[PDB]
Amino acid sequence: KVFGRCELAAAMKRHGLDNYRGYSLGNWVCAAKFESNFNTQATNRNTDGSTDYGILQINSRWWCNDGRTPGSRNLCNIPCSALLSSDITASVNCAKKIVSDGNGMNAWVAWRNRCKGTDVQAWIRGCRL
């Protein structure tokens, strides 16, 4: 599913991401924009052989099981395929664990490079929330 900008903001807010660990809703929408262009079905293979899944491009090296990432963990206790659902519950609940791991949203390199320090409120501007 490809979400609209405000549609995804609303879904993320409903699932408890707004200001989760102090990160405002615009940060999460901005990260989703540059990780996946709001497409729940996005996948991308990493040079180390792991794969990133879903709206927030969550990596199989640590967070989900895909059966093809040797030596990896599954810290969210989910098949990586669950991260591709039209229902963002699995992606949100796993992102809560990721952002709580110590480095905040810097875990998402694209957030650090393209959202951090920017006017992220623009990503939720105009949305009925």
Q: Which residues line the annotated binding site for substrate?
A: 101
Annotated catalytic residue 7: no
Annotated catalytic residue 35: yes
Stretch 86-125 residues interacting with Ru ion (CB under 5 A): 101
Shortest separation between residue 117's beta carbon and Na ion, angstroms: 30
CA–CA distance, 77 with 74 (Å, rounded to integer): 5
Say which amino acid occupies 36.
S
Nearer to Ru ion, 34 or 62 (CB): 62
Shortest separation between residue 76's beta carbon and Ru ion, angstroms: 13
Q: Which is the catalytic residue, given 48, 52, 66, 87?
A: 52
User: What is the contact surface with Cl ion in residues (CB under 5 A)?
Assistant: 24, 26, 67, 69, 72, 110, 113, 120-121
Q: Is 41 exposed, middle or buried (0-12, 13-18, 19+ CB in 10 A)?
A: middle
Shortest separation between residue 78's beta carbon and Ru ion, angstroms: 17
Per-residue buried b or exposed e for 86-117, using 16+ beta carbons within 10 Å of the residue's own CB: eebebbbbbbeebbeeeebbebbebbeeebbe
Element housing 114 (H / E): helix 109-114
69 forms part of the interface with Na ion (CB under 5 A): yes
Nearer to Na ion, 27 or 69 (CB): 69
